[PDB]
Amino acid sequence: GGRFKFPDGVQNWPALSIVIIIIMTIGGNILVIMAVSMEKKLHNATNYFLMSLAIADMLVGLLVMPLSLLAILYDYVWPLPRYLCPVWISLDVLFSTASIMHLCAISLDRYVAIRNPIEHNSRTKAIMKIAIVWAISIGVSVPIPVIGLRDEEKVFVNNTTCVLNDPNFVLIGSFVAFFIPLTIMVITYCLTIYVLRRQAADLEDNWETLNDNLKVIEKADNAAQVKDALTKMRAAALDAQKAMKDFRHGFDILVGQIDDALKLANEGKVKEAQAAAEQLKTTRNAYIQKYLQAINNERKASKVLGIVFFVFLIMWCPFFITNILSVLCEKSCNQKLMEKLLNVFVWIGYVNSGINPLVYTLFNKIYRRAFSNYLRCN
Numbered sequence: 001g002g003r004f005k006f007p008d009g010v011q012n013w014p015a016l017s018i019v020i021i022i023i024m025t026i027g028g029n030i031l032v033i034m035a036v037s038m039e040k041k042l043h044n045a046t047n048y049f050l051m052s053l054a055i056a057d058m059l060v061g062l063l064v065m066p067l068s069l070l071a072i073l074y075d076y077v078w079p080l081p082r083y084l085c086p087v088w089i090s091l092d093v094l095f096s097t098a099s100i101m102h103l104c105a106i107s108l109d110r111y112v113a114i115r116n117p118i119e120h121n122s123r124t125k126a127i128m129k130i131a132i133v134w135a136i137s138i139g140v141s142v143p144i145p146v147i148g149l150r151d152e153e154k155v156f157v158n159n160t161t162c163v164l165n166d167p168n169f170v171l172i173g174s175f176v177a178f179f180i181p182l183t184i185m186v187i188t189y190c191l192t193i194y195v196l197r198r199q200a201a202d203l204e205d206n207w208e209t210l211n212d213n214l215k216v217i218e219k220a221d222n223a224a225q226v227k228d229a230l231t232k233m234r235a236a237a238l239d240a241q242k243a244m245k246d247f248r249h250g251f252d253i254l255v256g257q258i259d260d261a262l263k264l265a266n267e268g269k270v271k272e273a274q275a276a277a278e279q280l281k282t283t284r285n286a287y288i289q290k291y292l293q294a295i296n297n298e299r300k301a302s303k304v305l306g307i308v309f310f311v312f313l314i315m316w317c318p319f320f321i322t323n324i325l326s327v328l329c330e331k332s333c334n335q336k337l338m339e340k341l342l343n344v345f346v347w348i349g350y351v352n353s354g355i356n357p358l359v360y361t362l363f364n365k366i367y368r369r370a371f372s373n374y375l376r377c378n
């Protein structure tokens, strides 16, 4: 009666339990799609892009993970019809790349928004980005149907197991789908953290000059000395202002005290100006806390960026690196262990798709309360 498998030919039940992570991925992104849909605040362009990413990652857990689970259930013997594997593999390359490409764009956008925060029809650009991202991924995926259709031996080999059999594609696909985006995310990340640290140093330097000039005002006795030190603060305040409205307004109201004290410093006596430097001391200490919460925001952003980039490396690097070694190293490297590692590094890349939502909820207050409400509402 032929050679059957399903629904009881399962050879590995311990692997079945791994469904747990699958259930987390599908729902994890659904909550994001809910947040961007229900919440009025999350109708921002960048959030629509996170939704697109969520669509990519959700489809990974929806269409790629379950079929890889069946593959493990039957000890890597394809139980489904033959035509359904090249379909599976192509989807694997598609959504996985879409996930990567999306992540790369997020890095780029975050750099621009950090460099020149003056940015705010605004949706047409986001639509343009989503389209381009999905267009590139499709390009990376179309070789699968092409190669598979023009030769059956290249998708599954022993009339049993289904695995890529074209080393040229593996090299190219890996190089263009991961290593080029990786290079962009490396340089991008480095520039972003550089800009961030430079902005922090600027605020700290402006605050130091505001203190040092006050000390030397209380110190010396020359009316022109008070004039010089008292004028250098006016610039240090105007420069720190352009670097939360109560803070810039604090620099604006203390500037007025620098005007009064500077008027009484040239035509008046040094003692009265030094007495005005006291009122300046108090107006500075009034906002010393708002200065600390500003620099704290700087260090917070630095940590979040370092996390997301680190996670991306830890997740996708093992697969693609070993994938490269498995093709271009056909002798020196151990091949049996290579397959043993790749089998796990594949699902590590999968887990990244489920980590992305869990990442953008741990740090955003709106997503935290949005998730905490979607889980308890139903």
Ligand SMILES: CN1C[C@H](C(=O)N[C@]2(C)O[C@@]3(O)[C@@H]4CCCN4C(=O)[C@H](Cc4ccccc4)N3C2=O)C=C2c3cccc4[nH]cc(c34)C[C@H]21
Binding pocket: 092, 093, 094, 096, 097, 140, 162, 163, 164, 165, 166, 167, 169, 170, 173, 174, 177, 323, 326, 327, 338, 339, 340, 342, 343, 346, 349, 350
């Ligand atoms: C996670 N997903 C997995 C998928 C894949 O390899 N899936 C199979 C089914 O799993 C293997 O790794 C297994 C594990 C152990 C032995 N295996 C192999 O030998 C061959 C790889 C290989 C072929 C020839 C020579 C050396 C190595 N495998 C396979 O075909 C390809 C991906 C990919 C390749 C290229 C560009 C890409 N963009 C996004 C992606 C992607 C997503 C990304």
